[PDB]
Structure formats: structure tokens, C-alpha cells
Amino acid sequence: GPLPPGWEKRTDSNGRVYFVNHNTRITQWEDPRSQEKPLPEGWEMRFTVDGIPYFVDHNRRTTTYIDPRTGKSALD
Amino acid sequence: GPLPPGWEKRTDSNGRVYFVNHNTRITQWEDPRSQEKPLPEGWEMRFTVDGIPYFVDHNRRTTTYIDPRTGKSALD
């Protein structure tokens, strides 16, 4: 599909394709649309009865559908 | 100042104040306005000539002012 907002595909001097995130000013080799990466310290992944992933934060002792690695909901 | 968007301060049955993030559906004891917490694996913090923190991602081999722990820019 389309790149997510703020991202651009570029080509370097040698003709290699890479990706730029203008929201953070990073560049990276992998397409951000593709898609190990560990969860941050103190977190675990579990699955609901329906097989939907969710995230357990043992630091704060809370849970969320939002993957802390990506900011994306497991429900979307 | 004000709570950040999506957050609410609540009181529990015992009268203890806690914080709710309706964007992620977590709750937590700490005020989100206050604000260990390690950087994620493969990251380091450095400082510019001006003493401004920035973040080095050795996984992707890139750098950013945006703290991966918070999504907030070191420049804001």
C-alpha cells in the first residue's frame, strides 16, 4: 500500500533504495510497510481468547493492545 | 501544566489518585507530566556540541532527536 505519513522512498548514489522518516529524521534500509525485535525490558506478549496479541507491562503493572515497539494496535 | 491529550486523573475506592491513558487504555500510578528507564536494546544517548540529547540506534545505524522511550523530541 502507500508509505505511511511522513515517509519517503529515496535512491542513493549507487542506485540503492532506502527509506526516510521525516517525522524522526531517520533513514533506514527496510521498508516501513514490511514487518526479531525484542519487546522493551519488562514487557511480554500474550494472546486473548480470540488469538489477538496484547502487551503486558510488568514495570507499570498494566496491559494494552498497543505494541510498544510500533505504537500500533493489535486490533487494527 | 495540563495533562497531555487523552489522559485523565482518577481516584480509586481507597482515595488513591492514579492516571489513565485513553489512547492506550493503560492506567498507571505516576503522573505523565513527571519525568531510570533504559533505552531499548541497541540504543545509546549522546549529546550535541550544544548539550542537546540525541539517540543513536545501532540496530538501524541511524540517529534521531526523538527519544524512543517517549516519542518526544529532545528539541521540544
Binding site: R10, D12, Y18, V20, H22, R25, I26, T27, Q28, W29 | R60, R61, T62
Partner: peptide, 12 residues
């Protein structure tokens, strides 16, 4: 041999 991606400022 790993290679870093191009610098934001060199590129942009």
C-alpha cells in the same frame, strides 16, 4: 559487511 543507511542531511 553491514552498511549504515545514508545520512539524513547528505540525502535531504
Amino acid at each position: 559487511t553491514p552498511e549504515a543507511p545514508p545520512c539524513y542531511m547528505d540525502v535531504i
